[PDB]
Structure 1
């Protein structure tokens, strides 16, 4: 007969038995503080200190680092080993008189990152009497305690999965969003045309045009680099700004200082009688990894297989997560049955050093597994 479920983050309340509601739209890039002494209706000399601190909205973006975009010049040469053979990016036609194209005057202009996942959050700290609790609350999730609920509801449409972020300088400060960075076909002149994915090695663009032998060679395709073409119409692209940036491997976090954006905050307080925590349950979970497949740094992602032991309940509807170092990369909602369970969790993100663990709530397995590299 029981059907325990902890996927509901929130409370049941009797509106007569609640003491304070705060409900407001908050600038995303602003913190908020509330301090009050809760006092009994003139009846008694017993007061409770309430102290709420909501931190500025943070964005966390799981990315694949694409390396550096380059500017360069396309050079045409006529011969009759090509004189230009040491150039990494080249194109040739033999007449049997050799025509060649090669890229030179290469210069890195920026660092590019492919967006895999976008998540917004606020750190929320609540002191109620001698209780003090801080939690990072995802947008569209809730902080739940015995006497205080804090829910954050919002929407942002600035970034999308698949977008490519370009940072030109030591770009704290800001960057550009590209919605059409070249992937499966890179032609000279495209955004993303000339890349170096790591220290060495260029991924060269295609040169779709034709040679002509005139004996002076000509090439009739585009001769302008993607960097120059983008700069020539730079106002066509969307900038964004950043503050207190934190790059880690395959992840970027920052606070967006765009003060036109807002989210909704609801705070409900009950002074005497505790809230009914809708996720309360007696079920106990043990976790370990079994296997993994797929890749980090990949829009396709990975799948972590977990062995999950349920005791103290016949069944338990919950979520098993793939996490490492308190960042979670995936979750699977599942009705567990008493005893052993096998649960597959699909995730995306992470880096070569990530060990993806099976987690429930704030509890994780003792070890995690490494996923494979992308773009092999």
Structure 2
């Protein structure tokens, strides 16, 4: 009764038949190199070159680009007409993308009309808030997923292999195991990253989403080139009245933009630094130069007898996509349906992944049965050009599918 399983990434070893162990805490922002000649314990003349290169920790963040945050000024105007409905007249702020209008229609009165207006219960006083002097101040990105990794290269004799190793995963070969164990608590899913310039940025934990009011972090956004998502103005208008005098609008809510309020208490917010940053559609990768952070590296070497590869198996997998639902750029995510054929084993416990161009976006552990299988993989991230493929290890299907856009 075989119960094949390749979800274990690592090795079985006999401590007596192991020749070298390196165990250390490494600065996350530092590389590490190890070179050694493994010579046979005396009683031979055969040496083996061991060369290990571990690269700096990289962070990869799947994001939704939120566009630009703007600074601006809130202006208030008044438009009065003696007679006629409010829609009968066009107002100065009508061209303003972000405006809030309150109408005082059919409400003219003797002690609130100008001298040329004998109207009672007629016409319109229109109050108008609008944003102007708009200026973009930064680009904002919503964090969907966070993963850290190091590229690990191992030469043992003439064998040479490089792999990108995720934090809390292991590099496995016949003679060398490299495991990385770490934790970082700097960034969280749902955080919003703000980049003010063309070095670093700020983390916002409460960027407005379902309610944006003027004054909030993220209050005035342009998701793309043209078109604002305008904030709410929660305050009230008042029509200030006087005899023989044109009505005057007033607004009693907050008048200070979110950018100004944030900049007035900027020390309340967390900055981060970046090095060698790589923006792609809905993804950002960089190396965090924070030298206070460390991760744990263990390297185990057996010179003569091979490690037992704990995921070794004779099972063979064929893959193709069937369908997809859900969205890229979304915290809710997508589901990729894969048709997976298993041969050479009655059952096989493994993981099927949703990947594109060697980036993984989701994975499902599954016990496959001999023959055809239908496997659903939940994923998050990607962009409109992503074709998510069904993958097993380094092997992927011939095509992938596109997910739908978010925020439709």
TM (normalized to structure 2)? Answer: 0.91
Aligned-partner Cα distance in 1 for 2:100–2:405: 30
Aligned-partner Cα distance in 1 for 2:103–2:341: 68
Deviations 1:61-81 (A, max 9, x none): 000000000000000111101
Aligned-partner Cα distance in 2 for 1:167–1:242: 11
Match for residue 221 of structure 2 among 170, 192, 195: 195
Displacement of 1:181: 0.2
Displacement of 1:275: 0.1
Deviations 1:254-278 (A, max 9, x none): 0000000000000000000000000
SS in 1 for 2:92: coil
Aligned-partner Cα distance in 2 for 1:226–1:109: 11
Deviating beyond 4 angstroms after TM superposition, the runs of 4 or more aligned structure 1 residues are none
Displacement of 1:36: 0.2
Displacement of 1:98: 1.2
Displacement of 1:82: 1.1
- Correspondence 1:163-202 to 2 at 5 A: 163-170=191-198, 173-202=199-228
Q: Which moved more, 1:74-83 or 1:143-152?
A: 74-83
Displacement of 1:176: 0.2
SS in 2 for 1:205: coil
SS in 2 for 1:16: helix
Aligned-partner Cα distance in 1 for 2:259–2:320: 48
2:83 is the alignment partner of 1:89: no
Match for residue 403 of structure 2 among 365, 371, 374: 371
Displacement of 1:343: 0.2
Displacement of 1:55: 0.1
Deviations 1:316-373 (A, max 9, x none): 0000000000000000000000000000000000000000000000000000000000
Displacement of 1:184: 0.3
Displacement of 1:12: 0.2
Match of 1:36 in 2: 36
Aligned-partner Cα distance in 2 for 1:364–1:85: 54
The runs of 5 or more residues in structure 2 that have no matched partner are: 81-89, 106-124, 241-246
Aligned-partner Cα distance in 2 for 1:77–1:164: 34
SS in 2 for 1:95: strand
Displacement of 1:154: 0.2
Displacement of 1:315: 0.2
SS in 1 for 2:180: strand
Match of 1:125 in 2: 153
SS in 2 for 1:85: helix
TM (normalized to structure 1)? Answer: 0.99
The runs of 5 or more residues in structure 1 that have no matched partner are: none
Q: Which moved more, 1:303-312 or 1:91-100?
A: 91-100
Matched length: 374
Aligned-partner Cα distance in 2 for 1:43–1:76: 92
